[PDB]
């Protein structure tokens, strides 16, 4: 009869009212549910106390806050209103680098994970440049190339860079509509020897992430906090005891 819960959360997106495929939202550090009710009050005046005598509720709302520490692209799509874009690995053959380059310039490439970088000189007789005259910062992860030097007989300035780029996953900002996801919290209550508890929320509309600290200070893992409103599902039976907002199952 005491609660200290630890467990997992499964989310299923709702598209045009058809149930989606459940997925694990990965690690979650905090889950909170808050209930709000509006009440209209009636006061009697026969006792001289002008005090409250009755009240009936008019409003009913529920909010859910979730703190997730996973920065996976699947979660980014759900939290950033984005849609995942997958780019397959490939090669570049005739990319043209900026002109008027001199020692000290930093060239930014269009793709990441560059490898086997080659820069052919522009001339009737192609002459690849010596690798010792350029360096790859951040082991080519950021696609940045630094010029270390140039031969005394200055070669033709425009260059032709060819290389290989690895596959990547990208998420756009505000590129998807407001997601609607059904939530299933499967938890273990340690206070009762690890008893099972299940919480079902049929329809939830989420709110974008509020803050995202890209450069963190301290020993705390970056956290992503999402707020959402539990909407009223109109498909479930009205008279059923399961309600229309959410339910809790405890085995006993």
């Amino acid at each position: 009869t005491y609660f200290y819960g630890q467990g997992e959360i499964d989310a299923a997106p709702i598209v045009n009212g058809v149930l989606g495929k459940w997925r694990w939202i990965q690690d979650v550090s905090a889950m909170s549910i808050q209930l709000a009710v509006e009440k209209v009050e009636h006061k009697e005046s026969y006792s001289g106390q002008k005090a409250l005598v009755r009240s009936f509720p008019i409003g009913k709302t529920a909010t859910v806050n979730i703190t997730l520490h996973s920065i996976g692209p699947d979660n980014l799509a759900l939290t950033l209103y984005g849609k995942v874009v997958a780019k397959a690995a490939g090669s570049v053959t005739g990319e043209v680098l900026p002109a008027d380059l001199v020692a000290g310039d930093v060239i930014r490439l269009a793709n990441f994970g560059v490898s086997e970088l080659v820069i052919t000189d522009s001339a009737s007789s192609p002459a690849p440049l010596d690798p010792q005259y350029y360096a790859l910062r951040a082991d080519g992860a950021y696609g940045e190339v630094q010029l270390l030097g140039l031969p005394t007989p200055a070669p033709t300035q425009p260059f032709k860079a060819a290389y290989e780029y690895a596959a990547t996953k990208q998420v756009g900002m505000f590129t998807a509509p407001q997601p609607t996801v059904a939530l299933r919290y499967k938890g273990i209550n340690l206070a009762e020897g690890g008893a099972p508890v299940i919480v079902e929320l049929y329809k939830v509309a989420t709110d974008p992430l509020q803050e995202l600290a890209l450069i963190s200070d301290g020993n705390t893992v970056a956290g992503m906090q999402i707020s959402g409103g539990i909407l009223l599902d109109t498909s479930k039976p009205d008279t059923g005891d399961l309600g229309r907002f959410g339910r809790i199952i405890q085995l006993g």
Binding site: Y4, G7, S29, A30, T67, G187, N189, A191, N219, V221
Partner: protein
């Protein structure tokens, strides 16, 4: 609660002359060999965030872990030439094996610090107050 599986290879009997030294103040004058000389500093704790969960009131506990460097080779009150210059590769090896080389980890980050670990000298031979994070 699974680190030993990789700790087994993390530790590889660094000193060849020191035997049963129970390594983890230093002598700096009669040490048989330049052992790892690991040290412990403290711990990091926090709640009310993604670290804390539900039952069992546990959280991702921050852990502190540091090392002491004992070479005294080419640096015997002469100059700091060969003390850390040779250690550089050794420091990288130590920080990559003892830290940052973790098993399949889900809630065990095993944080590693390649840079940003200042060390100051004293006592006239060598001191190295290393500052590294463990998080587990």
């Amino acid at each position: 609660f699974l680190e030993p599986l990789l700790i087994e290879r993390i530790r590889s009997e660094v000193p060849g002359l020191a035997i049963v030294s129970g390594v983890p103040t230093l002598s700096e004058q009669d040490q048989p060999a330049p052992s790892a000389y690991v040290v412990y500093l403290g711990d990091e704790t926090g709640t009310g965030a993604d670290h804390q969960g539900g039952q069992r009131a546990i959280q991702t506990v921050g852990q502190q872990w540091a090392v002491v460097l004992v070479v005294h080779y080419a640096d015997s009150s002469n100059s700091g030439e060969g003390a850390r210059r040779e250690a550089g590769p050794l420091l990288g090896r130590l920080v990559k094996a003892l830290t940052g080389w973790a098993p399949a980890i889900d809630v065990a980050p095993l944080a590693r610090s390649a840079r940003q670990s200042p060390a100051t000298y004293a006592s006239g031979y060598l001191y190295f107050p290393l500052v590294f994070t463990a998080r587990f």
